[PDB]
Each structure stands twice: as C-alpha cells, then as structure tokens.
Amino acid sequence: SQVTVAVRVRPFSKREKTEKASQVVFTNGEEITVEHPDMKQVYSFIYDVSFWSFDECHPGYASQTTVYETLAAPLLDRAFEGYNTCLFAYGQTGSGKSYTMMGLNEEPGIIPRFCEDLFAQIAKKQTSEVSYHLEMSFFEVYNEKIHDLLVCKGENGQRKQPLRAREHPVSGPYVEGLSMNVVSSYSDIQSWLELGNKQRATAATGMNDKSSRSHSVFTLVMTQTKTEVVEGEEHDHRITSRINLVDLAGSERCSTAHSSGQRLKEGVSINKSLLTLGKVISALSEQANGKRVFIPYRESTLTWLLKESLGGNSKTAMIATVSPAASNIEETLSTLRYATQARLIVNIAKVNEDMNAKL
Amino acid sequence: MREIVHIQAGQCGNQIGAKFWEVISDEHGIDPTGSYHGDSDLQLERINVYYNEATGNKYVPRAILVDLEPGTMDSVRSGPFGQIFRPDNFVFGQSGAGNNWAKGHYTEGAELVDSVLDVVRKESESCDCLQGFQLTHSLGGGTGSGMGTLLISKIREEYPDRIMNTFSVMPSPKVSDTVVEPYNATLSVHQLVENTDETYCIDNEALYDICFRTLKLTTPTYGDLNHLVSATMSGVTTCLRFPGQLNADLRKLAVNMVPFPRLHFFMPGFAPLTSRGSQQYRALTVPELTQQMFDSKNMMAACDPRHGRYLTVAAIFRGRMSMKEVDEQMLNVQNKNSSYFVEWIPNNVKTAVCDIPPRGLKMSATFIGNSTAIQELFKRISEQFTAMFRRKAFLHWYTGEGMDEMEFTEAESNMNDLVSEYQQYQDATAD
Amino acid sequence: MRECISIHVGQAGVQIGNACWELYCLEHGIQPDGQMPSDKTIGGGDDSFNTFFSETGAGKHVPRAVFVDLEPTVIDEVRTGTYRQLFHPEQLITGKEDAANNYARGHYTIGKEIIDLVLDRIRKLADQCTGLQGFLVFHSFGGGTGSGFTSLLMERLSVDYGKKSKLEFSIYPAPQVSTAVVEPYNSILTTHTTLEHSDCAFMVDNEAIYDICRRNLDIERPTYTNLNRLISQIVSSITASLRFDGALNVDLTEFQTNLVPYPRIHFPLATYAPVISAEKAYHEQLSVAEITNACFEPANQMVKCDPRHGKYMACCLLYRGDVVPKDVNAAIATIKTKRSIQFVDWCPTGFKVGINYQPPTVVPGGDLAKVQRAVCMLSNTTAIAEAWARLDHKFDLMYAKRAFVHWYVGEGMEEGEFSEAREDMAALEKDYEEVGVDSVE
C-alpha cells in the first residue's frame, strides 16, 4: 500500500567529459535542485528517497548494494510473508538504466542480488518438512498487444503470436497460452533473459541506433508448500506469491525527431501506457492515505495484467534513472515530473464530525 | 471531404435506416428514384458526406445492411424509399439468430462477416477522405448485438484512427421485448466500451412517454420513434453538411464529451418537439429550446439526470440566431443548476451552430450529455443478470455454441467496474 | 513602398477577414470584382493603396492575404460568396479533416503536410514587395487550429524571416463564457511557445463585445458579424497610418517598440470609444475629451479585466479624422491628473500618440454610425495576469485527474509538455507581479 518512488543521478560518461558539457543536477541533501544554464529559472524536486552517484567522495553515495538494501530487500521480505510485489523502472536511452537493473558481470545491478538472496533464503529456510517452488514468465507489450519473449518463432518472418488477456473470477487476470518455465539456479535465469532481450522490439531513431519501443515484464511466481497435517500427509494451506519487475520504454515526445510512420504509432501507445500508469500510482498513493478512491486498471493492458500486484496487501516501488548533463536536460525533467507521484502530505484540508460518545 | 458509412443491422436498425434515409433524402432533396429536385445550391455541396454519385445524377447512398434473416430486408426493399440502396449491399444469410448473442458473434456471424468486410473496404476506399462510420443496432437480440459488435471489433482493428459511432436501442426497465436482454446487452457492453469512441444510448419507454406527454399522440407506432431517432442522427452531423458560424464535427464531440475513454455513453435529445395543435401557442426562440432540452422528460435515456451530475454537454443548434443568447442561456444552465454539474471541470458545456435549418422549422436544437446517472441502466441489467446466472436459467443455449461460464463473468465485472467508475465522480465531495 | 501581410488562421480569422476586407475595399473605393471605377474616372493616383493590395495590368487588385482553416465548411463560402473574384484562388482548403480542438492535431498530425504550401505562398507574396513586412495573424485561442497551426507558423517564420515585426489580433477566452471545454489547455500551450516568437499580440474577448454592443450600440440579439465589424474598425484605425496620410504616423515597428518594454509582457488590450448608434449619434458632441476619458473607462474595454486592480505600463492612442493635437494634450493632462488611473514609477511619459487625417467609413447594414472622428487605444497593463491566473487555475482543476489528455497523446504529445507549459506560465505571472512593484533606493 505504497509507491516508494526513487531516483538515481548517474555520473558523467567519458564522451561527455571529453566533450566537457556542464553539470546542472545538484542536491540539497535529500531535496534536489536543478539550474537551467540560462541563469533564469530554478526547479525543485522532493522524493521519499534520492540516490546520488555523481562523485564518489560525497556522503550519501548510492552504489548498487545501497540500491538493493534500500529498495529491493523489503519486496523479498514481503514476498516471504505470502503477499505479492511489483517494481518499475523508467529512463530515456542513455540515462543509465540497464546498468541499474541487470548490471554487468563485475558490477552487478538489482536483479542478481534479488535472485541470489532468493536462493540463499531458500537454502536457509527450507527443511525436510517445508519446500519452495519457483516459476518464471517473461513477456512484452507492443501497441497494447501482448507478445511472449520466451519463445522462438518459425522460420517465417514477422509472425509474432499475439496472445489474449482473460479475467479469472478468483485467481485474477492472466494471459492465455503463456509459457511458464521452471528455474532453480541463476544460470537458467541469465539464459532465459538472454533469449528474451534479443527478441525484444528495438529500432533506430535520431537519439541512438538501439532504443526500446516496447514494455517488458519479468514475472516470478513462488509457492510455499508448508502444508503438513499432524494426522498424516495432507495439505492445508499453500501460499502463492507473485514477484514482478518491469522495464518500461521512454515517453519520446514527437517534435525534435519527426516520426512519420509506424514509430509514431508505437510512441503514442507507449505514452498512453505511461500516463495511465502514473494515474494508477497516484490513486494507490491516495488509497494509502485512508481515502477511498477508484483505481482505473482496465484503462490499459500492463495494469490489467498486474491488478492483484498493486492493490490490497501488496507492495510496490519505482525507480527513475535520469541524466546529469545539460544536453539531456529536456528529456530529464520529464522523468522527474513523471515521478513526483507520491503527494504524501501537500496541503490537505480538514473537516470532521464526531460526537455522542456518551449517554 | 468528410464521409460516413452507415452499417445497419437487425430488425431495429433497418427500420431506423429506412426512416433515416427517408429524412436525409428530404434534407438533401432526393426522390425514391435517385434524382434531385432541390431548391438551393447548398443542398448538394456536401451530399457526399452520406451519399455517392452515379451516371445520370442518381446520388446513390452508402449503406451496408447486415441482417441474418431476410424478413426486414424484404420489407425494406418493397417499401417507399427501398429502391435506391445498392443491391450488392443487401447482405443476408439464413438460420436467424433467435435472440441469441452466440449466434451472431461466434459461429454463424463468422460465416457472413467476411462479405461485409469486403463491402466495407469497397465503400471506404472509394472515399477521398474518411471521418468515421456508423452502426444502428439493438441490444436485446442476436444479430444487432453479436454481428454488430464483431464488425465493430474487426473494423476498429483495421481503421483505428477513424471514428466509430454507435446508436443503440438499449433495453428498458419494465417491459422487455425479449427474455434474454441482460445477457446479450452485458456481453455486448463488454465489447462496446473498449472498442468504440462514442455511443449514444437510446430506450423506447422514454420515447413512448415523449410521444404521449409532449406530442399528445394516441397511436404511436415505431415509425414515429424512428422519426425522432432520425431527427437526432440528422442534427448530430449538420456541421459537416452545411455552413455555419461556429462549425464542428463528430471528432469534436467525441473529444470534448469523453474525458476518459470508457465513459462515452451519452443521453441524446431533440427540440422543439410540440403537439400538432399546440404550435400556435409557443414562441420558437432559444431559451425555450434550452429549457426543453435539459428537461428530463425529453431525454431518451430512461433516466432522470436529476438523480446525478452532468459531466459534459454538447448542444448543436440550427437556424438564423444569435450566439449571445446561446452563451448566456448555457451560462445560466451552468450556474442555476450547479448541483447537477461537475466542479473539477469549470465549463461543462459547448456549442455548435448551422445557419441552414431543417425543411419546415425556423430553428432546432439537439442535445448530447455524459452523466453519472446512466449507471442506473447498467446497475439494473447486472441486477437482472446475476439473478439468472446464479441459477443458470438460459445458459445452455449459449454454451451449445462455443462459450463457457467465464466470459459472462468478465462482462459482468467490467460493467460493474464501469458503474463504480461513474460513481467516483458523483458524490458531492468538498476538498 | 510599405506592405503588411495579413494571415488568418481558422474560423475566427476567416470571418474577421470577411469583415476586415469589406471595410478595406470600402475605404479605397474598390469594388468586389477587384476593379476601380474611381481610376476609370481619374486615370491615375495611388488610391489603390498598396500597403495591403497588389496591382496588375487589367485595373485589377488582389489582397496580400491568405487564409486557412483545415475546415472547408468556411472557405467554400468565400469561393462561392460575394468575394470570389477578388482573392487569389490559393486559399488552403487542405482540410480533409478538422483539428478536433486538440493542439496536437494542429501542431503535429494534421499541422504537418499543410504548412509548406503556406510558406511557399507567403514567399511568393513577399518577393512581390520591395519594402516593409508585417505578419498580422488573425487567430484564436481554445481551438486546435488557431493554437497549433499558429504556433508552428510563427515558429517557422521566426527562422525564415527573423527581424520582422509579427503581430496577432487574438481572441482571448472569456472567463465564464465559452464554446469549448478543452479550451484552456490549448491557450496555455500556445502562450508557452508564442511568448518568444511573437512581438506583440493583441487580445479581445467576446463577452466584452457582447456587453459593449448591448449597452451602447443598443442591439440585443447580435450575431458574430456585428462583433467582427468592430474589430475590423480597430484594424483599420491601426493600419491607416501606413495606408493614408496624416500629421503623425505610427508604423508597425513603433507599437512593438513603445508598448513592449520587457519582451515577455507583450500582451496588451484594446478599445474603441465611439460605438454609438445613429440614435445616440445625435445628442452627443463627440469631442476628444469624452473619448480619451471613455477609452480608459471600464465597460467599454474589449476584454473583461478591471484595470483598476492593476497599473498601466504603457498606452498608445491612434486617432482618425478632424483632430486638433491641442485637445489631445489637454486630454492626456486630464487623464494624468486623475487618481484612479495609476502608472508605473518607471514610465512617466507613458503615451504614444498617432494622428491620421481620414475619418472612418460606414458599412451598410451595420450598427455603427457616421461620425467625424474615431479613436483606438492599445494599453499595456498589469491586470490581465488575473485573467491568466483563472486559466492557470482551471488547467489545474482539469490536470490533476489527467482529463482530456488521452486525446492529446493520441496525436503524438507528451504529458510533460503540459507541466512545462504550466511552469513557463508561472514565470510570466510573476513578471506581471514584479514590475508593478514601485522601486526603492
């Protein structure tokens, strides 16, 4: 019942430092301030958490392990309590995103620490009496069509199989005909992700030869089989849990780069999904404030396939990867203005009527 | 040039089509043969918005008639104005639906739909530009619901940037003309709110009361009700068809009237409706029409809006008039009746004017509203629905043609979620 | 010679042009077929005044104006109305679809593919002038065409031509009245862009003209033409300094130099004092004092904004007819002597006067009346911020729920643009609040 928004301001690249563009993103500790190079207007931003990675010697450094121990481990702890969990990710191409979720071989990200602590606590908590099972699915969303990233298509060309969403009455919604493979060791997970990302939809526009035009969901599902009756072998209460980590595409604005084609039709749906997702997050944050409010989930696909993982006794989180430079300032604020959606205590009024607590 | 296609399904849509063309032909000056007998040159400048052309200036229409039983078609063809429609468009089959939604969406309708698509692509590609399509069906039977919704889905999957505007005769509270109305209507609403840009709900009991109280008729047959529906269809799209002072289009209505994509179910209405012996004792002016429009016993929605709040309003006027009276009277509506409107939008009203009125009236007006009250319809159907699903009354006629008990639940949950979505913007909450 | 290119965008601009060119062709003795019986009678003279018209060899004249709507319901009236033989046939019915009242259709999906023709035709108009340039863009807020296409055209003309005065005789939304409910968003996103490329954009509001036409003209059931002829008289009173002769001339540059102190506050108001009918045309002296006291009088301003809530940063005054400048000096002395007409500490001069020699004309079938002198005032204040504030309130009440945005991203826009425009709009509201402060050592 939370949003737990967060940012991450990367350090300069090598090309940027040789070209020597300006630093503009600063920090007043936790609160952030940014200063347009025209000396004209300053913009302020507050979040529940702020990660700084620009220069090492500054206190409050935000390493990869800091990211894990501050964001991810609570999701795992609440998964073990029998609830579900979701995590988001936002960033335009170049804002240091894939280095954050996946990481590198010598510099891990968030995914591997998550999965390895998963296996560790499995091998710890597990007994001869109790067990743990774990399955995976990994799919994508392109023009609001669902596609499965965990398969190889025929020798034909673009004959991608579009699947269908269906609402179960009890277990909640799901996708029809989705591969649900089994895993026990990280060597399987890396293999599956490598089959995945190479099938994801990518194109070349004015920003880079390699960008992302589709959302990508990575779902794990876990089962506690602590079901052992005293009289004999009989099962009482399995517990299912749904862990979810999604990489979202950027909200490219169609002005500097004329799209004139299918790329426009992708961008528009991508924009729509992001707007609806922010709208949902604001409503859930308000619901956490004790105020009953509607939670529009059927207005998009990525939410309708993730209803039960962002409501009730669930837990959520967001992370926003932005850039420090001035040559990527216009795409930078758009991220931060997209991640202001906590609105915890900002000028709430007060009216109350409560009496007759007596004879 | 803007161009529209009229799809026309069921035993209700085809009679409506006969009347609709019997009205638009008289507004554009066409005879049952095809020829032109008009009086003004404005009357064919934009005839292509609904019609096509021919060899000897016969001005043939654009119409696609998608029944499954030939009865309505064979009643239309041997009729007053059923001699012009392109006989390659009298599409039909056999083995009618039988007031079953499964026999129009899954098994039989698929053995006819591809022909209809081949006709639609023909009637589209021969247009210079396109603005949208139309579809008149009922909800309560098989053909108009199933076949119409399948066509909606496939057409929107083909041409999604264009508009799809559906005029639907939804069921009534008291006297149903079918026993399986809730099931069909609910399974259709599961496929209309997702795949449509604007739907204008219509009911017959409201039309009966509008024909009894206002017009003081004694023997109202369906001709008079379809006459009203045609009068609405016609004044919804004058802005594309004739000049004006503040023109409009269907996209403007579908934009301004639809804050969020789901809540596009609208209450229609027409003015000046008066008795045949009582037009002596009235003044054809703007405020009287504005009074008659927002009145509840003139709306075709079977639903007093005074039970709820107005979200957004579209009033299309016709006649040589003044815009100051329009703006002032709409202001006084926005002001004197604030509790019937929404506050997080300041301006819950827009306008549109054509300076070329109908054939025999100085002025006229048409009304479209997006309210919270229309949930009372859906809230009824669901209460009608589940009582039958909880005991599975008429289920097997729907499972014997390729279904399960899950899709019904999907439709019910979607409709109930929409009810809650409408309720979210109704209760008078103060910050 | 001098020249002023007049552009019209949308329904508002096209109808305003239908009125403005009626008035213009009435002033220069022109006939609706382009010809002139006057030169047939004379055989010479510059009466075919070429600040707006262009000559040919057949005694014919063409206006130096194009108009476009992306909505062919309008232009076909001109092509089959009274004024089809006059205009060049190059009027852009490219309106295969309407702009749907969303900035995104006017600015990207249908804005693109219709502007290169407009640029080519503007270039063909400009290469036929060896002199001044000024783009008088008659456009509108609220709508998608007058917002989008306007913002794109001024943006491109900032590049292709640069140092040339670009003006706009806009139509500002009323705070209560309107005819559209996605109206404010378009206005904000228009201001955010055209705060840079423009030089001075005038403003009117139809609620004010309604009140002005019932209170003074005494007509209670008006159309839009009876509102537009007043704006046409405003435009004529402006441009007569270039068309006709007089004692003090005020070209297009002088407005942008004498009323635009800071660049980001180039948003003045306008008014026209004698709006009396033939009945009230008698019983009244119509001197310069009555006018100059009436131009600063609320309920005769063309925008609903009490100036007394703020101060007057600058003021231009453009007269027509039998005027003795002495009376103007006396009038301005009187206006300065009063105390309910404030002024900034940093502008004691304040006024820019311009005097012509011709009176106005009288359109037949009109409501205004034959008079011996007429006036226009163009004021730059600190008051209309309040009006903008109302817009920047309404936006918020609509934006906090992301209403009417799916129709905007559905044609290629981003959410952030709304936030960027609102943030930019806040930077202006402080400027109008900053200059009103009186300096202190």
Ligand SMILES: CC(=O)O[C@H]1C(=O)[C@@]2(C)[C@H]([C@H](OC(=O)c3ccccc3)[C@]3(O)C[C@H](OC(=O)[C@H](O)[C@@H](NC(=O)c4ccccc4)c4ccccc4)C(C)=C1C3(C)C)[C@]1(OC(C)=O)CO[C@@H]1C[C@@H]2O
């Ligand atoms: C005083 C006068 O002019 O005669 C009116 C008249 O008295 C009334 C009764 C007409 C009459 O309408 C009806 O008879 C009627 C009765 C019950 C239900 C529906 C219609 C009229 O028949 C209807 C007819 O109106 C039209 O013809 C419109 O063009 C209408 N089309 C048709 O009626 C039509 C004509 C031929 C074939 C099919 C239909 C229309 C509406 C919208 C857009 C285009 C056209 C007119 C002027 C009248 C009569 C003749 C009495 C009214 O018609 C409408 C729909 O507005 C009912 O109230 C209006 C105006 C009058 O009250």
Ligand SMILES: Nc1nc2c(ncn2[C@@H]2O[C@H](COP(=O)(O)OP(=O)(O)OP(=O)(O)O)[C@@H](O)[C@H]2O)c(=O)[nH]1
């Ligand atoms: N003063 C004046 N205002 C007008 C006139 N015509 C239209 N308007 C204003 O224009 C506004 C709506 O115009 P628009 O939405 O721009 O219509 P349009 O000019 O065709 O532009 P689009 O609809 O986007 O294609 C209304 O609020 C009117 O007040 C006119 O003739 N005179």
Ligand SMILES: Nc1nc2c(ncn2[C@@H]2O[C@H](COP(=O)(O)OP(=O)(O)O)[C@@H](O)[C@H]2O)c(=O)[nH]1
């Ligand atoms: N308004 C109106 N409704 C009609 C007309 N004819 C039939 N209906 C309605 O249509 C419904 C019956 O559905 P039907 O047309 O038989 O469905 P179909 O068998 O699939 O074509 C009932 O609710 C009727 O009220 C008509 O002429 N006018």
Ligand SMILES: Nc1ncnc2c1ncn2[C@@H]1O[C@H](COP(=O)(O)OP(=O)(O)O)[C@@H](O)[C@H]1O
């Ligand atoms: N905190 C960090 N530590 C080290 N390198 C970083 C950090 N943040 C970003 N980078 C660098 O930024 C680059 C981002 O690569 P790229 O794949 O373009 O990112 P994105 O996922 O945004 O497309 C990487 O080469 C990475 O080394």
Ligand SMILES: [Mg+2]
């Ligand atoms: Mg328009």
